[PDB]
Design a protein around this ligand. Sequence first.
Ligand code: DAD
Ligand code: MG
Ligand code: MG
Ligand code: MG
Lengths: 105, 667
Amino acid sequence: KIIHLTDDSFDTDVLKADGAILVDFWAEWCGPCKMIAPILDEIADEYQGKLTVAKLNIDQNPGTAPKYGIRGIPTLLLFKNGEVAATKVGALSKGQLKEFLDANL
Amino acid sequence: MIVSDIEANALLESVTKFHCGVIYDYSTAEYVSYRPSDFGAYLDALEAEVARGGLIVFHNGHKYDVPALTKLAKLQLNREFHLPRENCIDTLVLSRLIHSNLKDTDMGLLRSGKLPGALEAWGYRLGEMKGEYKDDFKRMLEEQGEEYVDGMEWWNFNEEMMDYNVQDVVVTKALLEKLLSDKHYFPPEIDFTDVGYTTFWSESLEAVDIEHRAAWLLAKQERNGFPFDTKAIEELYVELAARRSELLRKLTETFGSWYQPKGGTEMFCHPRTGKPLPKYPRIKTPKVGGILDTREYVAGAPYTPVEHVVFNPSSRDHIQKKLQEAGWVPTKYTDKGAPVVDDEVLEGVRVDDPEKQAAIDLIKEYLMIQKRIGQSAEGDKAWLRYVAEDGKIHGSVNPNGAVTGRATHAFPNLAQIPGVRSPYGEQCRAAFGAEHHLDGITGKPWVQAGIDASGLELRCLAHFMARFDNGEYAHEILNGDIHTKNQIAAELPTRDNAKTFIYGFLYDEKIGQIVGAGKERGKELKKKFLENTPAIAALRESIQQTLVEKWKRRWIKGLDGRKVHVRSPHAALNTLLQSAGALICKLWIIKTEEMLVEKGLKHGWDGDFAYMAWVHDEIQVGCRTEEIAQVVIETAQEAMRWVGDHWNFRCLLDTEGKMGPNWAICH
DNA sequence: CAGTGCCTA
DNA sequence: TAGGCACTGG
Ligand SMILES: Nc1ncnc2c1ncn2[C@H]1CC[C@@H](COP(=O)(O)OP(=O)(O)OP(=O)(O)O)O1
Ligand SMILES: [Mg+2]
Ligand SMILES: [Mg+2]
Ligand SMILES: [Mg+2]
């Protein structure tokens, strides 16, 4: 149930969407990214209807990330009705992630 | 014979004060120090040695001490002081001749760590004296809680400077006697520290006399400088910069930016195995942070620090990254794990996307535009950075910087200005010209005389094979232009391509590449040309047999008798011909100037002509009038014929002269 | 400071 | 198959 974004769809899928959307900026060559990926798949299913999990591979879609000043990956950006509400960088555990979501949702 | 050295407040261009000087006199064996108020006496002593028909030894005195003293005598004492060329010896000039196989720092201008090979000890010390004196000065200041200002060690005379002056003469004396002990250049039966100047030049090897005349003349060439069109180069810069910007705009739209790992400190380890993962980008593990905590990090939650990078057309790494992504599969790599990315391979790179394929051409245009901007304006050695107040560029010349006897040029290198046939070469070349110098009296621009030795090394080849073919080649050469005659046969595009061919050949793939074909054509041409001239093999053999046997002798005897170091058995023929060419040209420019002077012409901007540049076998001479330019051209041809006769050359030597306003028109 | 690549003859 | 020098990346 993960939404795979692209530079051209990001605006309407994330910024113009309704409800909370968690965006994961990642790269295939990042160890930490590969670590949290599995966790994100589980969150997506667990938080159905209460949250939307999206992913943007910065190598295939190079235009978006810079606009948000990315300096490290994975970068978890939470958008609420068009804007960033919270942000966390690094390979959080499922537990740490659930906390981040619950507390922020 | 006396040995001397001086300490002054600045480089020749802006020197205004004589601080001190030291003289060692062989006839008394004593050292005499001269302090600032002793300047008059210092000069008197030098002219006294000249009155005795004596000799004056300086280390690098031809480019500095001698010119500096003429300048300082006029400014400080309103005195006319001009040491005759024939009374001066230069141990740097000597070392560069005897130890032609070694590099030097060019008196501290070059960092010794960067130079390859060993360095002669005495000359090394002499070249490092300024830097050492500076270090002493600084520490001595900081020792007194005083601050140091760059170059203040040279503003005033002090006993520390005095002591270094004495040390320079002691070391120079030692260097001198070490050079004089080389029996190949100086007959052991003569004590050269105890003879008059006339004897010194006539009894020592010809090379000794030739190198001193060359250094004296080239030192003059440096002071003349090459008139330079500053305004034209600034306008060129503006044009190149805008095109650079436009190419960058187009390229950064075609090849978007990306992210790269950067700043990672820790090693990424498999979260389950613990297995270190060296290949993976380095990560960073935050120590502080938690889930309300507004911070974006969480202790123990690792992430890969990265950086945003924009496509840099000057980066071979970036070029290589985008082209492979576009489907390019390199064929040739560097002997260090990296795909070769030069203009030649770029020209052959094919990809599917038409826009990216077309961008390859923009990349090549961009690299080239950068080469011109760098050389003309932005590089550390850029022309715009070197033009002096007099409106000229005074490039330096090491008269004997190459092992073969050729000279080297730097600061900036005026022997590497883009040719007229290359992109923007006409503007570059046109900026260097006699027309850019306005006569000091009439305000009228000077005119340029450019003379180039014709088919020089092919004629040197003819000379050396004459004892194998009795002069057939030398004779065949003076039957039209050899290079044009080559181009035709080789079916080559340009007369330059024919030159680069014949010289690559004389000294299969490389041949084919230069000719534009493959190893097959290179081979065919290599044979068709060798079979045409078989005596070339005999000359090679004879050379090999004389040097190799593990060396039998690792040097070849140059036209003036000096030893010419041979680096490898394969480069032997080239060494022999390039040295012959270099030495022919060297005596040639010396004789040309001597003849102009015997004709009553004055050398200088305040005279009739001025040597502006010497690029191996061509000279560019600034002339006050067209008539003088004509005399310079005809005289250069006569000097060449004189050189050919002087060394009994087996092939007639010639020159080609052109009169014009600048280098674009005179070469 | 080293690896590459271009400028000249 | 003699040299100088610029630009990138560590
Ligand atoms: N690519 C090269 N490789 C080796 N030596 C070269 C090369 N180009 C030139 N030389 C040497 C041999 C000739 C000498 C002077 O250069 P130049 O090109 O003027 O000689 P040239 O005799 O070919 O031409 P010209 O007859 O037009 O003066 O420098
Ligand atoms: Mg000195
Ligand atoms: Mg020539
Ligand atoms: Mg030439």
